[PDB]
Amino acid sequence: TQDEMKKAAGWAALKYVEKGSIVGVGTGSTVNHFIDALGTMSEEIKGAVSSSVASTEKLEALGIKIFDCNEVASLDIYVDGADEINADREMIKGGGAALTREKIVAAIADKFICIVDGTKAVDVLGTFPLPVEVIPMARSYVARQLVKLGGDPCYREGVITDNGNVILDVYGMKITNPKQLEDQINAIPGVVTVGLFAHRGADVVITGTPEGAKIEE
Amino acid sequence: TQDEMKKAAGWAALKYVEKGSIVGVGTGSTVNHFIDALGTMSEEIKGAVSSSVASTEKLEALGIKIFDCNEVASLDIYVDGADEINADREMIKGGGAALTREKIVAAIADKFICIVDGTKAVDVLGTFPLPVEVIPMARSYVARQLVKLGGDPCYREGVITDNGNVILDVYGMKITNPKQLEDQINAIPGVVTVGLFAHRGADVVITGTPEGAKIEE
Ligand SMILES: O=C(CO)[C@H](O)[C@H](O)COP(=O)(O)O
Ligand SMILES: O=C(CO)[C@H](O)[C@H](O)COP(=O)(O)O
């Protein structure tokens, strides 16, 4: 879209931030704008948990206390973007962000508020390549296993995750049963995290639009 | 029980080694006797893939070439001990070994040869604590989910894995559906690897008995 639909979206999420709460925050241009609105009410927020280095440092600057996951038993909400989202509110995530961090913070939060522009909604997950984080000694193993499942895995070379794992971006899948494929990939030895958020998906999906931001609760 | 028994199981495994092959080798006292056996055949095999730092050293001193998992497309056999093993040949492993390492070599290998003394076979898995490797930031969350599954997770403090992950040793479970439980744990965000070898269990079980090795196939 334009930076303004993203921004319309990001600011519409501020309405789920209640007083005295600790806010799950994700990462991305759309969440950027959400962090901008969150700063306008820093005084009635206990603080935040972020799955992103950029967001954390931005929350800090704004004087928002940062929590770690092990300090909390739950989050009320986690606000975050998606790579793709289907009509069942299942998503591909982690293409351009810390996949493992996201999926953990999302797991701990009660409500997932997905904030997105017009380009993320799809009927069938998979045109956007699915990321899988992989123990490096297992990389060729996992790739073979992803092939068998009807993917074409491409090793994201020259980079690792903060933990030192590698990433395979899997192309060419027609992910008609995301919950199944999550299970299948999660069961391959050497898999760390898969970027299918199917068992746990979006709860509220906010889309940026020319005029304003449509909310699907 | 006795090392004589462990020794008996270890040497009994030599029989499964093909001239010219690259052998999957595991860890432990029983495995060391197998490494002894492999030695008497050094100049005749191609090399070994090891799941163990101590086993790697031992193979090297026999002049056996070390291959990494990324270097092979498969392994013929993987010979390894287990912490517990049921009548369905499903195993708890990783208790005092490189959990993730073992599960990956085990996945890549065609036949898993489990060498044990009399003390490893159990009726129901779970008296020995189930090791789960966990992303640090996920530890409390994953612990809370394992409790929901009927376990009492105990954080193995002072140590991390190679990967820099932590270990939860999970006591108190009656693991009467190992395939199911491995599915449930594998699907908790923040889990890296669980010490249930259930979907891929042992193909051959060698037990050292008071009356020689005994082979269950
Ligand atoms: O890569 C994904 C998560 O890793 C997301 O789609 C992205 O990080 C955030 O969305 P956007 O930049 O479109 O607002
Ligand atoms: O591969 C290791 C996993 O914990 C162990 O060494 C194996 O389970 C046990 O065999 P042994 O009783 O001789 O050590």
The number of helical elements of chain A comes to: 6
Largest sheet of chain A: 6 strands, mixed
- Please estimate the helix content of chain A: 25-40%
Q: Can you tell me the CATH architecture of the largest domain in chain A?
A: 3-Layer(aba) Sandwich
Main interface pair?
Answer: A-B, 33 and 33 residues
Ends distance of chain A: 22 Å
Q: Major sheet of chain A: order of its strands?
A: 2-1-3-6-12-13
**Share of β-strand residues of chain A:** 25-35%
- The first-level CATH class name of the largest domain in chain A: Alpha Beta
Would you write up a description of this structure?
- The structure is a homodimer of 217-residue chains.
- Chain A is α/β, with parallel strands linked by helices and 217 residues long.
- Chain A has two domains: 1-123 and 196-217, Rossmann fold, CATH 3.40.50; 124-195, Alpha-Beta Plaits (2-Layer Sandwich).
- The first copy, chain A, is built from six helices and 13 strands.
- Chain A has helices at residues 3-12, 29-38, 53-61, 99-108, 139-148, 178-186, and strands spanning 22-25, 47-50, 75-80, 84-85, 91-92, 109-116, 130-134, 152-155, 166-171, 191-194, 196-197, 204-208, 213-216.
- In chain A, a hairpin with a 4-residue loop joins strand 12 (204-208) and strand 13.
- The radius of gyration of chain A is 17 Å and the shape is globular.
- Chains A and B meet through helix 4, helix 5 and helix 6 of A and helix 4, helix 5 and helix 6 of B.
- The complex binds ribulose-5-phosphate (5RP) (2 copies).
- One ribulose-5-phosphate is lined by residues 6, 26-30, 80-83, 93-97, 102 of chain B.
